[PDB]
Amino acid sequence: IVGGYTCGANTVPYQVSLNSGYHFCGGSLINSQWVVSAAHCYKSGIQVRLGEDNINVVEGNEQFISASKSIVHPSYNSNTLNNDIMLIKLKSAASLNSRVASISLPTSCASAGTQCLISGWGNTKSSGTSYPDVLKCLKAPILSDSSCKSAYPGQITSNMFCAGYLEGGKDSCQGDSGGPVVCSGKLQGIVSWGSGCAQKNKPGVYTKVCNYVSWIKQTIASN
């Protein structure tokens, strides 16, 4: 996260770190056994880390659970990042408490202008490189469809939305991928892509979760 702030330990209790020997992507806990992330975060040998603040120190509230199964969206396109969504099942159920908690799925899609909370352990620099140890947060608004498509002509599907600041300086970045965008208490987005981070006229692009709620529900009911 570029130009964000320190969240505060366990104030975002649905935030997970995906670990394959090192943190590489975020995710969201949506019930005691399931995590939503980005399909481009796919890899084998995922361990899901819940209750994290400092991802390099064991602070006492963590739960480390291996994934039993990953399921990339059937229509995921790795060229365009259309349908950039994946489900991860945990080998055992997480214990839910004040520090580990699920986030609700949306019943209806979010509206342009709505302020949302984006979080992760990704790069905090615009052009350089610095990765944080504690969880970073950012408030950012959903941008109109028209301004999104203007920023990224010929690249935006109806399964994507833009959020952020056209003036630049505030954005998600690499290492935040797969993490949450939470608006009005619902998971509305997944950190997907962007042209650089925090650049003028290049806002963040997010997977539009409300288009996938049927697929998530049926997949969880069968696996």
Whole-angstrom Cα distance, residue 25 to residue 23?
Answer: 6
CB of 4 to Ca ion, least distance (A): 19
Please tell me the count of residues contacting Ca ion according to CB under 5 A: 3
Q: Which is nearer to Ca ion, 17 or 82 (CB)?
A: 17
145 is catalytic: no
172 among the known binding-site residues?
Answer: yes
Task: List Cβ<8 Å contacts ≥24 apart for 41-46.
Answer: 41/86, 41/177, 41/178, 42/70, 42/72, 42/86, 44/70, 45/20, 45/21, 46/18, 46/19, 46/20, 46/70, 46/88
Q: Is 59 annotated to bind ligand?
A: no
Return the CA Rg of the chain: 16
Of residues 32 and 54, the one with the C-beta less far from Ca ion? 54
83 is in an annotated binding site: no
CB of 187 to Ca ion, least distance (A): 23
Query: Closer to Ca ion at the Cβ: 53 or 171?
Result: 53
Q: Which of 17, 28, 37, 40 is catalytic?
A: 40
Q: Which of 28, 84, 102, 192 is catalytic?
A: 84
Q: Is 174 annotated as a binding residue?
A: yes
Q: Is 171 annotated as a binding residue?
A: yes
Report residue 11 as tokens: 């104030």
**Comparison of 58 and 93: residue with beta carbon closer to Ca ion:** 58
Measure the CA–CA gap between 105 and 220, rounded to whole angstroms: 13
Q: What is the closest distance, in whole angstroms, from the C-beta atom of residue 51 to Ca ion in the complex?
A: 8
Is 177 assigned a catalytic role? yes
Write the binding mask 39 to 68 for Ca ion: x where contact by CB under 5 A, - elsewhere. -------------x-x----x---------
84 is known as an active-site residue: yes
- Residue 164 burial class via C-beta count within 10 angstroms: exposed 0-12, middle 13-18, buried 19 and up: buried
Q: Classify residue 167 as left (phi > 0), alpha (psi -120 to 50) or beta.
A: alpha
Q: How far is the CB of 155 from Ca ion (least distance, A)?
A: 36
The CA-atom distances, in angstroms, between 138 and each of 69, 78, 219 are 30, 26, 31
Give catalytic residue positions: 40, 84, 177
The binding site consists of 52, 54, 57, 62, 171-172, 174-175, 177
Q: Which residues bind Ca ion (CB under 5 A)?
A: 52, 54, 59
Instruction: List the binding residues for substrate.
Output: 171-172, 174-175, 177
